[PDB]
Amino acid sequence: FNLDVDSPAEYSGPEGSYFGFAVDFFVPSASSRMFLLVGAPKANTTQPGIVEGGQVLKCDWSSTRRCQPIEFDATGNRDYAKDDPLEFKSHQWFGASVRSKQDKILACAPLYHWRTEMKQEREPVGTCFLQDGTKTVEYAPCRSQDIDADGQGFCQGGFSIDFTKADRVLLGGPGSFYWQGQLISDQVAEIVSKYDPNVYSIKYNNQLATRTAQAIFDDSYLGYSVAVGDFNGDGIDDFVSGVPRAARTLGMVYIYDGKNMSSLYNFTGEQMAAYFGFSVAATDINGDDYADVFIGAPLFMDRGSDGKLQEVGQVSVSLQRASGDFQTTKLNGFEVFARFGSAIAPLGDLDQDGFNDIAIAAPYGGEDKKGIVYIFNGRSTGLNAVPSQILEGQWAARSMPPSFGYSMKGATDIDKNGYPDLIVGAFGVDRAILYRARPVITVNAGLEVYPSILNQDNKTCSLPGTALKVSCFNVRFCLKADGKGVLPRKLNFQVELLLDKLKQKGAIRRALFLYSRSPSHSKNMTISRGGLMQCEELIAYLRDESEFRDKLTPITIFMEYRLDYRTAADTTGLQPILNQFTPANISRQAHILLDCGEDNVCKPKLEVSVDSDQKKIYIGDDNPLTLIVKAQNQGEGAYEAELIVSIPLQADFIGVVRNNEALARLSCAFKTENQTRQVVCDLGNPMKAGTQLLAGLRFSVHQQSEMDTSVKFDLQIQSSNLFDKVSPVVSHKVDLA
Amino acid sequence: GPNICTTRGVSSCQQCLAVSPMCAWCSDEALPLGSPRCDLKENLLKDNCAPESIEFPVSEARVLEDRPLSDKQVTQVSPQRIALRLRPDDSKNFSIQVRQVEDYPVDIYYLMDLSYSMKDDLWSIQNLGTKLATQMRKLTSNLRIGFGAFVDKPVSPYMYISPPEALENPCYDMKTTCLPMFGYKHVLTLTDQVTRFNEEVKKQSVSRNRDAPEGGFDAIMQATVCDEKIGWRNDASHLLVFTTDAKTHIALDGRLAGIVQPNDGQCHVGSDNHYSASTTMDYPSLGLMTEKLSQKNINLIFAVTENVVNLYQNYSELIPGTTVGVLSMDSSNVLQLIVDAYGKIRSKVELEVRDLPEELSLSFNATCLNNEVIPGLKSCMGLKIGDTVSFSIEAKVRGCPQEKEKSFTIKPVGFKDSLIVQVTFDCDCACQAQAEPNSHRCNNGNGTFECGVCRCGPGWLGSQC
Amino acid sequence: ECDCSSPENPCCDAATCKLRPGAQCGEGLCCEQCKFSRAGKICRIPRGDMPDDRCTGQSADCPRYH
Ligand SMILES: *[C@@H]1O[C@H](CO)[C@@H](O[C@@H]2O[C@H](CO)[C@@H](O[C@@H]3O[C@H](CO[C@@H]4O[C@H](CO)[C@@H](O[C@H]5O[C@H](CO)[C@@H](O)[C@H](O)[C@@H]5O)[C@H](O)[C@@H]4O)[C@@H](O)[C@H](O[C@H]4O[C@H](CO)[C@@H](O)[C@H](O)[C@@H]4O)[C@@H]3O)[C@H](O)[C@H]2NC(C)=O)[C@H](O)[C@H]1NC(C)=O
Ligand SMILES: *[C@@H]1O[C@H](CO)[C@@H](O[C@@H]2O[C@H](CO)[C@@H](O[C@@H]3O[C@H](CO)[C@@H](O)[C@H](O)[C@@H]3O)[C@H](O)[C@H]2NC(C)=O)[C@H](O)[C@H]1NC(C)=O
Ligand SMILES: *[C@@H]1O[C@H](CO)[C@@H](O[C@@H]2O[C@H](CO)[C@@H](O[C@@H]3O[C@H](CO)[C@@H](O)[C@H](O)[C@@H]3O)[C@H](O)[C@H]2NC(C)=O)[C@H](O)[C@H]1NC(C)=O
Ligand SMILES: *[C@@H]1O[C@H](CO)[C@@H](O[C@@H]2O[C@H](CO)[C@@H](O)[C@H](O)[C@H]2NC(C)=O)[C@H](O)[C@H]1NC(C)=O
Ligand SMILES: *[C@@H]1O[C@H](CO)[C@@H](O[C@@H]2O[C@H](CO)[C@@H](O)[C@H](O)[C@H]2NC(C)=O)[C@H](O)[C@H]1NC(C)=O
Ligand SMILES: *[C@@H]1O[C@H](CO)[C@@H](O[C@@H]2O[C@H](CO)[C@@H](O)[C@H](O)[C@H]2NC(C)=O)[C@H](O)[C@H]1NC(C)=O
Ligand SMILES: *[C@@H]1O[C@H](CO)[C@@H](O[C@@H]2O[C@H](CO)[C@@H](O)[C@H](O)[C@H]2NC(C)=O)[C@H](O)[C@H]1NC(C)=O
Ligand SMILES: *[C@@H]1O[C@H](CO)[C@@H](O)[C@H](O)[C@H]1NC(C)=O
Ligand SMILES: *[C@@H]1O[C@H](CO)[C@@H](O)[C@H](O)[C@H]1NC(C)=O
Ligand SMILES: [Ca+2]
Ligand SMILES: [Ca+2]
Ligand SMILES: [Ca+2]
Numbered sequence A: 001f002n003l004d005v006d007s008p009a010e011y012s013g014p015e016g017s018y019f020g021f022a023v024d025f026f027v028p029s030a031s032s033r034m035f036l037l038v039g040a041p042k043a044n045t046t047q048p049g050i051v052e053g054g055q056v057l058k059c060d061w062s063s064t065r066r067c068q069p070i071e072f073d074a075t076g077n078r079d080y081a082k083d084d085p086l087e088f089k090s091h092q093w094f095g096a097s098v099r100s101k102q103d104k105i106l107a108c109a110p111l112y113h114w115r116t117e118m119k120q121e122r123e124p125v126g127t128c129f130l131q132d133g134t135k136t137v138e139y140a141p142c143r144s145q146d147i148d149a150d151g152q153g154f155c156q157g158g159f160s161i162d163f164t165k166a167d168r169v170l171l172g173g174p175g176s177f178y179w180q181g182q183l184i185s186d187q188v189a190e191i192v193s194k195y196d197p198n199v200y201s202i203k204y205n206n207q208l209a210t211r212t213a214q215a216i217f218d219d220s221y222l223g224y225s226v227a228v229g230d231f232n233g234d235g236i237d238d239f240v241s242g243v244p245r246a247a248r249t250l251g252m253v254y255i256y257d258g259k260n261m262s263s264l265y266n267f268t269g270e271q272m273a274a275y276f277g278f279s280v281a282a283t284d285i286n287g288d289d290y291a292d293v294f295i296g297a298p299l300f301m302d303r304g305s306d307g308k309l310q311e312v313g314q315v316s317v318s319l320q321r322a323s324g325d326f327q328t329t330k331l332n333g334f335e336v337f338a339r340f341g342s343a344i345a346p347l348g349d350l351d352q353d354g355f356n357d358i359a360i361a362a363p364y365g366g367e368d369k370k371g372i373v374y375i376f377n378g379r380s381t382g383l384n385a386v387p388s389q390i391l392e393g394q395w396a397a398r399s400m401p402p403s404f405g406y407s408m409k410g411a412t413d414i415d416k417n418g419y420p421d422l423i424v425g426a427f428g429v430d431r432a433i434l435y436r437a438r439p440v441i442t443v444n445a446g447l448e449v450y451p452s453i454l455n456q457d458n459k460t461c462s463l464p465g466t467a468l469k470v471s472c473f474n475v476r477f478c479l480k481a482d483g484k485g486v487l488p489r490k491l492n493f494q495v496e497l498l499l500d501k502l503k504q505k506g507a508i509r510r511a512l513f514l515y516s517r518s519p520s521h522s523k524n525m526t527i528s529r530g531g532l533m534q535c536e537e538l539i540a541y542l543r544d545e546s547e548f549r550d551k552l553t554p555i556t557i558f559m560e561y562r563l564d565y566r567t568a569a570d571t572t573g574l575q576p577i578l579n580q581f582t583p584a585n586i587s588r589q590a591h592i593l594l595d596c597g598e599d600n601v602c603k604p605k606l607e608v609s610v611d612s613d614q615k616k617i618y619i620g621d622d623n624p625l626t627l628i629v630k631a632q633n634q635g636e637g638a639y640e641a642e643l644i645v646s647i648p649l650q651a652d653f654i655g656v657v658r659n660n661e662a663l664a665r666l667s668c669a670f671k672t673e674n675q676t677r678q679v680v681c682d683l684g685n686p687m688k689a690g691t692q693l694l695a696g697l698r699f700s701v702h703q704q705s706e707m708d709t710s711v712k713f714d715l716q717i718q719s720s721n722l723f724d725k726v727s728p729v730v731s732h733k734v735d736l737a
Numbered sequence B: 001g002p003n004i005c006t007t008r009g010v011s012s013c014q015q016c017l018a019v020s021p022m023c024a025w026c027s028d029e030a031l032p033l034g035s036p037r038c039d040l041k042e043n044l045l046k047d048n049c050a051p052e053s054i055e056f057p058v059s060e061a062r063v064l065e066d067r068p069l070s071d072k073q074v075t076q077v078s079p080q081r082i083a084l085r086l087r088p089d090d091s092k093n094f095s096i097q098v099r100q101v102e103d104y105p106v107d108i109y110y111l112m113d114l115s116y117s118m119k120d121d122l123w124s125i126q127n128l129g130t131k132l133a134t135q136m137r138k139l140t141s142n143l144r145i146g147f148g149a150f151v152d153k154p155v156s157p158y159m160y161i162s163p164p165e166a167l168e169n170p171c172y173d174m175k176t177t178c179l180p181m182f183g184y185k186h187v188l189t190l191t192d193q194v195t196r197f198n199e200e201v202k203k204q205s206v207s208r209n210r211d212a213p214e215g216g217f218d219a220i221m222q223a224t225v226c227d228e229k230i231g232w233r234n235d236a237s238h239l240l241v242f243t244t245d246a247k248t249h250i251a252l253d254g255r256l257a258g259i260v261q262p263n264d265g266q267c268h269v270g271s272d273n274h275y276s277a278s279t280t281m282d283y284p285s286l287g288l289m290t291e292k293l294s295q296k297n298i299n300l301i302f303a304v305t306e307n308v309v310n311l312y313q314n315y316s317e318l319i320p321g322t323t324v325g326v327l328s329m330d331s332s333n334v335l336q337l338i339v340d341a342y343g344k345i346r347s348k349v350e351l352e353v354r355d356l357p358e359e360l361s362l363s364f365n366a367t368c369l370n371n372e373v374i375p376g377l378k379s380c381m382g383l384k385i386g387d388t389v390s391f392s393i394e395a396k397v398r399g400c401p402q403e404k405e406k407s408f409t410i411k412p413v414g415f416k417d418s419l420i421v422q423v424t425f426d427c428d429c430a431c432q433a434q435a436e437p438n439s440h441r442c443n444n445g446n447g448t449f450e451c452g453v454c455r456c457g458p459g460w461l462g463s464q465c
Numbered sequence C: 001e002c003d004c005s006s007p008e009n010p011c012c013d014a015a016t017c018k019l020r021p022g023a024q025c026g027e028g029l030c031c032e033q034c035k036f037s038r039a040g041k042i043c044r045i046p047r048g049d050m051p052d053d054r055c056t057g058q059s060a061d062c063p064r065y066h
């Protein structure tokens, strides 16, 4: 979630050169500068007589965004005899796989063709060039004398490459032994020392290789993808390889011992032609020092909402345990035909939380099929199934799909800010894009209020301007922010305090600040990283006890803090980020003191009664009708108490009787809303316990239909309370005469 | 008693006829002035009006040609010539029956694996093609057939790119002659010439490549998406028969050959009848293949050898709507699959009306196989050869035009036969032909007298001027 | 001069190292219960785009139909 997407470092190569097909970081151990290693397998080099041999370019990140090729090989095709080209470097796809350790760079040409030492042939044995800064050697393990389709002649070594912790090169060629595939491991020191240009079939000591198998294992493509991790007791790196056509095109992943190339564990796909093993990643995702296996199946078809198979892709996450057990879960794709499991790139601890993260890309997803990359954050229980960030391709297809996300590289801090970066290569548009992770600021915000129960009678608070001595209560909010990586000590926060949250819908606001005299207050903070709770005191005063609508709804206090984003690392403005899984707001509740028994809620008992005193009215006249209504609450306080007299279509209201002291002068109104006309009269806010009301309402009735025979009223008291807020409905009938 | 006839048709005979279907007119001078001249026929008889002077034409349907629906020219819609006589503002109903007896049009495209592993199955695949043509010729009378071929993508490491003599002869290393390698070759367009199909099928020979998996899914996609090239008919059943004897290359297999561009599903077969994007586009995926097959309504059939029957059965499980058969010396399995696919063809009878007059209106009742009359519906579904369906159509005309004769054709969509009508609007009375020009008979006045009554001109508002 | 290389093969008589009556072969991929396999039977699955090696029906070994 902390990757910077607004201003990424965009790199461009020659048109049609497949620039960005392979990406990597170059971090020399003798220099403070870092470079991007971008392979362009179809680029035109300066080799004499070689067309589209491909090249690997190192790109300067500090300035000018310049990319300059690395001269692994400057000579053209060697000759076996006078007129007998020994090798064929044209269209060799050099740069299709780039790997880099501290000072070593491993670039391979899987489609490199060789004329063997026996007969004039063209065998894609594949070749690699290992550069140790000063000395560039050639590594061609599959250029041996076992040369045929049933040997290593079509091995295509360097299709997938990797580096182990013990300075070993894991090489995968999926063509060996009639396309069964092969894994070849060699020590880097042995490769450098044993190099000699005159000999082409160099035999390296201490080389670990997988042997040929039975013919029923043909066309399995072992070595299509490779990964390194530790999956047994010792510290050596074992060999994870994807075998996407194995088990009757079901797909398999072979884990081999890193010490003697012995089979360790197996993964098998659940669907055919899904390419289980197209991409393999090995990283610890739950932070317990056991490497986990991530296997992509970009062609996987799952059941949709209508039960039809849809090609969305899938990634299988297997968590390594103390024993050889693996806890396997599945991550399905989000868009059809997007090839979700195409590339899986470990990101390290992208947010410096404690668990490593991983990036999964669907290079044909998103709008216009540009490409999409998903970032998943590791948790203690595994991987979060919901991605936290979405990276979208921003370049349209020229002749071929942009394939944004076809290759990604991460887990390297290129700007020394403490967080790992991520390079994404879109070889369809010949682009390489560097995304920088932003510093994550974890904020522990608090909001303390003086006792939540507010007493309206307790009014020991002075006021400015008038000093009306009305009740008041305090609010205290504290802010502390800490984070890892490069981050200036003092961070600028602005906090806003809004009263009456969840109730502010154009209605009245009851809680007002003592000095600002406004429900909304905003204050800017300048707090330090790793500092104490910076707490400030504010005073808020309530309105008059008989001013706001009601005292039942709790007063809600809302604080919203946001980070001022002019916080740069003096590098083109890499702003920090707040933690995604933190509350950006904190809200507290304040209540009003109201005597409502021990249960803290007022539960009234509402009763209504009425007598006729006329018992008959004559049809032809406008008869004055006075109804004597008794409204009593024998329960507790009734908030916003009014009686509802729903008169029929016949009569209308005249006025309250005020000529006698036995009845009351209730404030009354005529209402017509919502298809029904009725009379309301205020009964007191609140309507106190045991209060017995008695009053009369004058009317005037004139019959509508000549056969009506009765006039029926309906009386009901209701309040805004939460329980027992309504009286039983009483219907009074007056007979027409 | 007083009715809509006595209130609208009292003007004259044609208007009385136009008022209502049950309005009747009296053309007898014996009827005294004051009694209604337009009323019920029973009312007119009660009013001692002469039956010969009663003009009550009843709308009716006169069938002209009613040769029965044929059974297995064939008669496919009965009746086929119905004469309609409609008085103005009247509705009349007639019944038709549509029976599907013409055989289904079927398009069969045959895909042959012409690789070197098929050297011992070439005879089997050719015999399968000939037996397919014969079986559908005996099954349906409207068969269109054609075929194509595939080997694999013509690039390294699949092709033998060395020595230079191996480009035109891939069997140079083994000292034999074979055809050059190709990706996909559309050999014969969908044609009704079964003899031509047999000759072209028998003329085929195999080619050679290196690895066991083949590029048959590329050929499947090309034959599915190149409608103009293959010759698919829109109003027909499409069967694609895929023949092979080995595993198949799938999507993402092309990265070994250097092909990283996904298949886009477009047509790439030019005038040379070759897959021009074979060396630049990756093999198609199962999802894209299924989507294209569903879009083009093509029934894929796998005619594979025994060693790959289970593999292609699982593939067909991944591709719904696909059947798998065993290719061998005898073609019984594939022929049975073809027979079942033909038997799973269901036809729909969509009623369409052409050049219907604006004044006329139609209402449709569908009596489908459920035997439940569904008003407002005109196209039953399902249906098989010989199966019959019936419709009840009621025609109503607003007033009457001056054409005095209209005709429209009722046709079922996709059916050769059709039903025509002869809508003869009465729009007037038989006694009106014997009308009297003006004055004379209508007393001393100068109005006009017809059908036993007189109707004066402007000014004269009297009964008889 | 022996039809069976192994003297212990039951398909060949031990006395004269010749084929016993009712038997035509003692070894081979196209040899079943000391009898030739049916013609057209696949006996050698090949590697790559290669045709299957069949049984001739008159011999006990697969011909080189490569
Ligand atoms: C993860 O999955 C992987 C893939 O499924 C597993 O790898 C597979 O493991 C199998 C054992 O579990 C292994 O099978 C063994 O293969 C070796 C290969 O040696 C052979 O040597 C022969 C002479 O040169 C040649 O083949 C002979 O045998 C075959 C029949 O197998 C005949 O058809 C041939 O004509 C020929 O006579 C080959 O050159 C080959 O190199 C065998 O030696 C083993 O034999 C053992 O078992 C048999 C019974 O099956 C015993 O009679 C015998 O005495 C031995 O004890 C096995 O057959 C697969 O080759 C291997 N495949 C791959 C691609 O790696 C992996 O084990 C699994 N790991 C986990 C942890 O699950
Ligand atoms: C690297 O440089 C080579 C130069 O050899 C480029 O190959 C050349 O590409 C052009 C296309 O711009 C080819 O022209 C083509 O000619 C054919 C007729 O032969 C015509 O039908 C095409 O429409 C097109 O105009 C040219 O033949 C070809 N030369 C070769 C292959 O030797 C290559 O494109 C460059 N690649 C990059 C990534 O810079
Ligand atoms: C009536 O309302 C007044 C408000 O003006 C209340 O006075 C405030 O009451 C709070 C607690 O209710 C007290 O604050 C205390 O401050 C000490 C430090 O002196 C602190 O250690 C405590 O933890 C607490 O925060 C204090 O009495 C007073 N504060 C202010 C700023 O005025 C009064 O308590 C209310 N009385 C009734 C009966 O409701
Ligand atoms: C390759 O290395 C593996 C593990 O380092 C060896 O496997 C062990 O072999 C010994 C002796 O055969 C057993 O006692 C252990 O139980 C094995 N450990 C396992 C299977 O985890 C293996 O022997 C080595 N040599 C090979 C495979 O040829
Ligand atoms: C307050 O913080 C919460 C998260 O702690 C957020 O409110 C959510 O906003 C998201 C994004 O619009 C919505 O999808 C959720 O439905 C919201 N949930 C809630 C509880 O409102 C947001 O950051 C802040 N919201 C406000 C109103 O300040
Ligand atoms: C086709 O699919 C079937 C069903 O999944 C496969 O049959 C299974 O084969 C495995 C072999 O490892 C057995 O363990 C299972 O018991 C079999 N299940 C059933 C139901 O038969 C079959 O192997 C698949 N064939 C191909 C060529 O893919
Ligand atoms: C379609 O069928 C309906 C139902 O049988 C027909 O509607 C009937 O029409 C007759 C004659 O006017 C009435 O006596 C019935 O009471 C009607 N029944 C219902 C349920 O509507 C309708 O006329 C038919 N239409 C055609 C074109 O055949
Ligand atoms: C707080 O910040 C806002 C916007 O940055 C500004 O308008 C306001 O004046 C600041 N308040 C104080 C007290 O500086
Ligand atoms: C028209 O419908 C009536 C039922 O209202 C039916 O009796 C009559 O037979 C129908 N006409 C024809 C031609 O079937
Ligand atoms: Ca290990
Ligand atoms: Ca782990
Ligand atoms: Ca993390």
Ligand SMILES: [Ca+2]
Residues within 6 Å of the ligand: A412, A413, A414, A415, A416, A417, A418, A419, A420, A421, A436, A437
């Ligand atoms: Ca960084």
Ligand SMILES: [Ca+2]
Residues within 6 Å of the ligand: A596, A597, A598, A599, A600, A601, A602, A603, A636
């Ligand atoms: Ca209470």
Ligand SMILES: [Ca+2]
Residues within 6 Å of the ligand: B117, B118, B119, B120, B121, B245, C050, C051, C052
């Ligand atoms: Ca074959």
Ligand SMILES: [Ca+2]
Residues within 6 Å of the ligand: B151, B152, B158, B209, B210, B211, B212, B213, B214, B215, C049
């Ligand atoms: Ca092939």
